[PDB]
Subunit: 410 residues, 4 copies
C-alpha cells in the first residue's frame, strides 16, 4: 500500500521537472507532517494536490548543487522559509507553510521584482476554492505598503542597493478541514526607500487610513510610540520589518506588525515583548517567563566548534484585532546555527514541562521520519530554524519552524 | 465542498484533450457508481487517478458529433463496452468496467490491429501496483489464441473481410480495497480465420496444452461435446465467441468460454444454459427459472415504435475452475433496443423480487444521478445494454451493464 | 511533406485542450498568412511556437456551440479581435494579430477584471526574446490610464454597469525577422468612470505628464481642441476610445489616440480625418479621397436581406511622434455586416486600381486557403470585419482585418 | 538569436523531467552535428522535434550521479550507444544515431525484457511520417530471431544468467531531407539460448526461410562456411553477434550479419574482413590496407597510465544485398580506452592523408563545440568509442562513433 505522496508521484503528470524535484523533497515532509497528526488520508490527497497545483508551480527553481540556477537572491536557502507545524492545547496541531512566491524567472530582467507570483498564487487558490479568498485588505494595503511592477521599475536606482527585495510573503494554513487559508505579509522596505520615509509612519498611516475607510478598530498607537523611541531603535534593526493580515472578511482578519532585534540580555529583550512597558497584562508576564526559560536553556549550550555567541537573534510580532482595543506579542528565538540534538532536546523537555507528551511523540516521530539527518549525524544543525513562543488567553503558541529542504543541505 | 471528480478535473493536468473530454463524460458516472455504494473518498481518488492514468489514455479518441474521428470500427459505440456495477447478496455490490483497449491510432496504418494498447495498459497497471499482475496464463495463451502484430500483418488478406478485429478485451475489477484487478478475454476469430480451423478446436486445444503444461484441472469436455453439435450450431453464432481468464496466480484464475445466440423460445435457450442437458445440477435450473422470468418480463413489452420482435439476442458464458471439476453458466439478455423505462421497471421489480431493496435504492440513485435522460425523456433507450444473470452456490449474479457514454447519445 | 502547423499539431504537447482547439482553428489561418507572403519555414516554426507558447495560453476558453463557456463578455465574438495582414507599397506585407488577453477565468469571481493575462503575456514574451520588451511607457501610463486589480475591486459599484470592461489590448507584430513586437492600448473608460472625469482630460493629462517627465515631444494640442467640441461629440461615441503605444525605446515609440463615429455623409466624416480642419496637409486629403472612394464603393451595395443602412460605422486613430511635431490620422470602415463577396470585390478592385496585383493574388490566395466559406456559400458575411485606410508619407496603409475564427461561425 | 535547441528548450513542454535532462545533454550535440554540416534550420527543427517526440521518450531514465536509477543493466553507459556522423567522398556527411530503446521501467518486474519500447518507437515514428516505415522484414524475422515478452517470461530460467538482455537495437538515419529512416538489428542470443541451438544456425535458417518465402536473393553461404569453423571460433566471441535489416521495401533492404573479435595481429584479423579468404575481391584488400594503417597508427601509442595492451578489440559486419549475389565487410576498431588527443590526431591525419580537409574542419568544429573536454583536459578518453572502416565501390565508409553523453562522464 503506497502512501499518498508515493502514489501521486507515480501517477501525476508534472508541468515542469523542477516541480517534480520539489515534490520529491517537500511532499514527503509535508505528507508526514500531515499523517503524523492525523490529516485524513483524503485531506492529505487534497492538500497534496493543492501543493502540486498552487504552491510548487509558484516556488521558483530547485536548488542545484552549486545553487547556480537560483537567481532571486536571499539570505535564506532557496525554497520555503519554513514548514510551520504548530502545537496548542488539547492536542490541536496544524500544518502551516510560509513561502516567498518566486516566479520561475524572478530576479531576472523578465521579472526583476517578482510581481506576478503572489497574484498567480492568490488567483489559483481562489479558483480552487471559490469564495475562500476575500480580497478587501489586500486591495486597501497593496497601494500603501507594497510596490507594483511599474513603480519599482521606474525607481530602480532607489532600491537596487537592497539585497533582499522581498515585498509579499504568503503563508498557507493547511486546515485539517481541507480548507486552506491564505495570509499575506507586506514588508514596506522598498516603499519606505523610494518614498524616503520611515517604516514606522508609512505602516501606521496605512493602518490608519484603513481604520477610517473601514470604521473598524485597530489600536495602533502603543506600537508606534514604542518603536519610535531611541533606545529601541539602537538595538533592533527596523528595516527587517513587515506587517501582515489575513485575506478574509476584514471583520475577521488581524493586523500584525513584525520586526527583528539582536539583544544581549533577556531583560533587554523584555522591551520588545512589552513594547517598552506600555503593553502589559496578566499574560504578558506568563509568556515572557517561558521565553526566558527556553532562552537560557538553548543558550546554555555552546556553538558547534567553540565559536562564541556575542548577542542573540530574536524576532517579534504583535497583532491588533478589529473588534477590541488589544494587541499581543509573539517572540522568536532564531536557532539556525545550533545543535539540532540540543535544539531537539530543549524542545522535547520544554514540551515535557508542559506535559505535551502526545506532542512529544508527535515531534520525535516527525523528526525521525521527515528528518533522518538528526540521527545519522551527531553534529547536526539543519532541521530547525526558529523556535517561536507566544502566550494567549488559554495557552502558549509554540511553533517549531523547520527547513523542509534540509535534505538539500546534506 | 467539491467532489473528487470535480476537484480533480480542476487540478489535474491532462496529457491530451480527449482524455479531458472522456474525463468529463465518464468520471461523473464512475465516481457516482463508486460513491453510490460507499467507495471511501480516498479510494475514489485512487481509482479515479488510475482511470486518469491507466485506462483513459488507453481508450482511443472521443466521439465527435458525426463520430468522424473514430477510425477503429465496431458494431458498438465508442468508449467502454459497459460500466458494470454488479450486485450480490448481503448487499455486496462492486464496480467493474470493460474496455477494448484502443490505441490513439488503432485502426489506422500505424496500428492496424491495435496491438500495443492492451500491453501498455497491462504494464502501466503493474507499474502502479507492483506484484499485482501475474502474467502466467497471458504468457501461455497469447501464442495459441491471440495474434500478434507481425502475424496479423503478414496474413492481412485473410482477416481483412472481418468487420470487428477485436482480439483482446480487458475488464477492470475496481475493488473497494483500491486494488484493481485485470481480466483478459481472447476471441480467436482472427486466429481461427488465418489458421482456417474451427473455433472450438483451437480454443480447447489451447486449454488442453495449458492443462498438461500446468498440471491444473480444467474440465472442458462437456462444453466441447455440446458446442460441437449441429442443432446448436444452427441457432448460435459461433464467431461471436471468446474465452477469458484472470491475470493472477493460475492456481486462482478461471477459464470462461463465451458465445452468443439468437433464440426463439426460452425452452430452446435452455440448451446454452445447460450445454444440451450435459451441464446439469440443482443450480442449473435455479438460474434458468429466473432468466425465463425476466425474459418474459422484459419481452412482454413492445419495441419503441411498434417494430416487431422476431427472436431474442442472448449471450452465454461458461466457466471452468482449476481445483475442481465443474463448469457453470451465465446468461445475458441484450436490451440495447428497449424502453429504458421498461428495462428499469423490470430491473427494479426483479430486484424487488429478491428483496434487494437497498440495491433498489442504489439502482435508482445511480440512475437519476448518473443518467438523467431516463427521466428527462419518457421515450428513452440508452441507459442499459445488457441484463446478465447467473446463479452461483449462494446467490444470483445479476449485473446491469450500462453505457456510461449514453450522454453522448443525446 | 506536412506543413508546420500540421506537423506541430502532430508532435506538440498542449498544456490544455482549449489550446489544442484554438490551434486547430487559428494555426491554419496564421500559418497560411505567413506562408502566403513568404515567411521562411523556420520563421514559421518560430512564430507558431510563440503562438503556441505565448498568446494561445493567454486567449481564454474556446467557443463551444452555445458559447456557454465564454464568461468574459464582449460585443465581439471570442478569440482575436482580428488577424490583420497589412499591405504597403513595394510588396511589403506583414502579419500582425490583435488580442484582448483573457485569463482562463477572466470575467469570473477569481479574475473579475482580467488583470494578469496582459502581464503574463508581456513577461512570457520577454522571456522568449530577452531585451526585446522595453517597459518604460507601460510603467508611466499603467498608473494614469489603466486600472489595476485592487483599485477596480474597491470601486466595483462604479464600473459594474459597463458591458465591456476592456482595459488592455495587445497587438503582436509578427515580424518576418522572427522578432515579434508587442503593442499595448489603454482604453480609459473604467478610469474616467471611477474618477468621474472626462476621457479627453485624463488621456491628455497622462500624455502631458509623460512629456514633462521624459522631455520628449508629443504634440497633443490639436486633438484636444477638436475632440473637446460639441458638434464632434454629438456624432462620435467618445467612450469607445483608447490611446496606444509601443513597448519599446520611448525615443522610438508613438502615442496613438483612437475613437469611433457613426457618420451620415463622407463629408461630415472628413472632420475626424482632419480634426475639424486643424489637422491638415498635402496627405490629409490624399487619404481622404481614397477613403471616400472605397466608402461609396462598399456602401453602394445593399445589406444582405434588404435591411436599410441608416448611418455608417467608422473608426479613427490619430498618431503623435516623439522626434517631431506631427499627428496623422487612420480611418476604418466597419464591414462586419456586409457581403463577403462584395467586400472582397471592393478590396480586390481597390487593389487593382492601386496596381497591387501581387497583393491581389496574395489576397485571393489567403482567401481561398484560409477562408473557404466565401466560395462554399454565395451569401457570406464572416470573413472580413474592418477595412482600414491611412496615407503616410509614401503610400497608403490599407489593412484588411479578418476574423480568423470565422470557421467557428459556420 | 537563439539556436533551435536553445529556443526549443525554452518553449517546449516536456512530458517528463528526464526528457528535459536528456534534452539538455543530447540536443546540443545532436543540433551541433546537424548545424555543423549544414542541416537546414527548419530541418533541424523537424529532427529535433522528432528526437523530442519519438526517441527521447524511448531512451529510459537519466543517469543520476551514482547511477542508481539505471535499472536496465548494460556493459555500456546509459543513453545512445553512439552518435554516429558518417563521412563519405564528395563531402557527403550524414547524421545517424543508435539507441537500444529502453522503456521507462525496462529491467524491472513491470518490463523485465524491454518489450514495448522498440514497437512504441516504431509506431510513433510511423505516425509522424505515414508510409515511411515498411514492416515486412520485421514481420518475418521477429518470430525467428527475436523473443517476445511472453516467451521470454515463460523461459526466464534459461536466459537469467545473461548480463545484457538486448534483443532489438534501433538506428535512426536522420536524413538531411527530414525523412528519418529506421534500422533494426536482432541479436539472437536469447533465442539461441532458450532453443539451445547455435547462433549461426538460427540466423541462417531465418534468412533462408525469408529467401524462400520472398524469392529474393540473399547469398549467405560463405558467411556460414567461415563462421562455422573452429580457428575462427577460438578467437572471436560468437555471442556478441546480431543480424540487421532496414524497415523498408524488402526489395530495397539489406541483411547485415555482425560479430566481434579479440585479435592479436592485423594479419590474423584479415580473416574476419575476408571470411577466411572466401570473401575476396579488388575492394576486399583496399579496405584492409586502410584498416591496418589506422590500426598500427592508433595502437602504436600507449594506454593512459602505462597499462599494457595484450590484444585488440575489433568488430565486424558483413552485408548481403537482395538484387545481386554479393556480401561486403565493415570493420571496427574499439577505442573506448584511448587518448582522445591521440584518437583525434589519428582521425584527423587519416582524413588529411585522404584529403578530406572539409571533413577535417567539420570534425574539429564538432569536437570543440560538442565536446569541450578534449581541450579542457589533456588526459581525456571520453569523446570517441569506435572508429569504423569499410571500403565500398567508390570510397571508404569511415564512421566516428562518439558518446554524445560524454559530458555525463565529467
Ligand atoms: C504572514 C506570513 C507571511 C508570516 C506569518 S505566519 P504565523 O504563524 O505567525 O501566523 P499566526 O500567528 O498563526 O496567526
Ligand atoms: C473477461 C472480460 C473481458 C469480460 C468478462 S467480465 P465478468 O463480469 O463476466 O467477469 P465475472 O463473471 O465477474 O467473473
Ligand atoms: C495598439 C493595438 C492594441 C491596436 C492597434 S494595432 P495597428 O495596426 O493600428 O498599429 P500600426 O498602425 O501599424 O502602427
Ligand atoms: C542496425 C543498427 C542497430 C546498427 C547498425 S547502424 P550502420 O551505420 O552500420 O548502418 P550502415 O552501414 O550505414 O548501412
Amino acid at each position: 500500500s503506497p502512501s499518498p505522496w508515493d502514489f501521486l508521484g507515480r501517477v501525476l503528470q508534472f508541468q515542469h521537472g523542477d516541480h517534480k524535484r520539489w515534490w520529491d523533497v517537500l511532499a514527503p515532509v509535508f505528507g508526514i507532517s500531515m499523517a503524523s497528526i492525523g490529516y485524513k488520508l483524503d485531506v492529505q490527497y487534497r492538500h497534496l494536490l493543492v501543493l502540486y497545483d498552487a504552491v510548487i508551480p509558484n516556488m521558483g527553481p530547485f536548488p542545484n548543487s552549486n545553487a547556480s540556477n537560483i537567481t532571486w537572491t536571499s539570505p535564506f536557502p532557496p525554497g520555503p522559509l519554513e514548514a510551520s507545524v504548530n502545537y496548542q492545547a488539547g492536542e490541536s496541531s496544524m500544518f502551516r507553510f510560509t513561502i516567498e512566491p518566486v516566479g520561475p524567472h524572478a530576479g531576472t530582467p523578465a521579472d526583476p521584482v517578482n510581481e506576478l507570483a503572489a497574484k498567480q498564487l492568490m488567483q489559483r487558490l481562489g479558483q480552487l476554492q471559490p469564495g475562500g479568498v476575500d480580497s478587501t485588505m489586500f486591495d486597501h494595503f497593496y497601494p500603501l505598503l507594497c510596490v507594483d511592477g511599474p513603480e519599482a521599475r521606474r525607481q530602480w536606482d532607489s532600491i537596487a542597493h537592497i539585497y533582499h527585495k522581498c515585498h509579499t510573503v504568503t503563508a498557507l494554513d493547511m486546515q485539517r478541514s481541507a480548507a486552506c487559508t491564505l495570509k499575506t505579509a507586506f514588508p514596506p522596505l522598498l516603499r519606505s526607500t523610494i518614498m524616503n520615509t520611515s517604516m514606522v509612519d508609512i505602516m501606521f498611516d496605512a493602518v490608519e487610513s484603513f481604520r477610517k475607510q473601514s470604521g473598524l478598530y485597530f489600536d495602533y498607537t502603543k506600537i508606534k510610540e514604542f518603536m519610535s523611541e531611541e533606545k529601541t531603535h539602537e538595538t533592533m534593526m527596523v528595516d527587517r520589518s513587515y506587517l501582515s493580515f489575513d485575506c478574509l472578511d476584514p471583520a475577521k482578519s488581524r493586523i500584525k506588525i513584525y520586526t527583528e532585534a539582536k539583544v544581549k540580555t533577556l531583560e533587554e529583550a523584555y522591551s520588545f515583548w512589552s513594547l517598552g512597558g506600555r503593553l502589559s497584562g496578566p499574560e504578558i508576564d506568563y509568556g515572557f517567563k517561558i521565553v526566558s526559560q527556553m532562552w537560557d536553556a538553548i543558550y546554555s549550550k555552546e556553538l558547534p566548534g567553540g565559536k562564541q555567541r556575542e548577542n542573540n537573534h530574536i524576532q517579534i510580532n504583535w497583532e491588533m484585532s478589529a473588534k477590541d482595543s488589544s494587541v499581543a506579542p509573539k517572540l522568536y528565538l532564531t536557532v539556525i546555527e545550533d545543535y539540532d540534538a540540543y535544539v531537539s532536546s530543549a524542545i522535547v523537555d520544554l514540551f515535557t514541562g508542559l506535559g505535551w507528551a502526545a506532542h512529544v511523540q508527535t515531534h520525535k516521530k516527525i523528526e525521525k521520519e521527515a528528518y533522518p539527518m538528526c540521527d545519522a549525524n551527531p553534529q547536526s544543525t539543519h532541521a530547525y530554524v526558529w523556535i517561536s513562543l507566544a502566550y494567549k488567553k488559554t495557552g502558549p503558541y509554540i511553533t517549531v519552524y523547520t527547513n523542509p529542504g534540509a535534505s538539500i543541505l546534506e
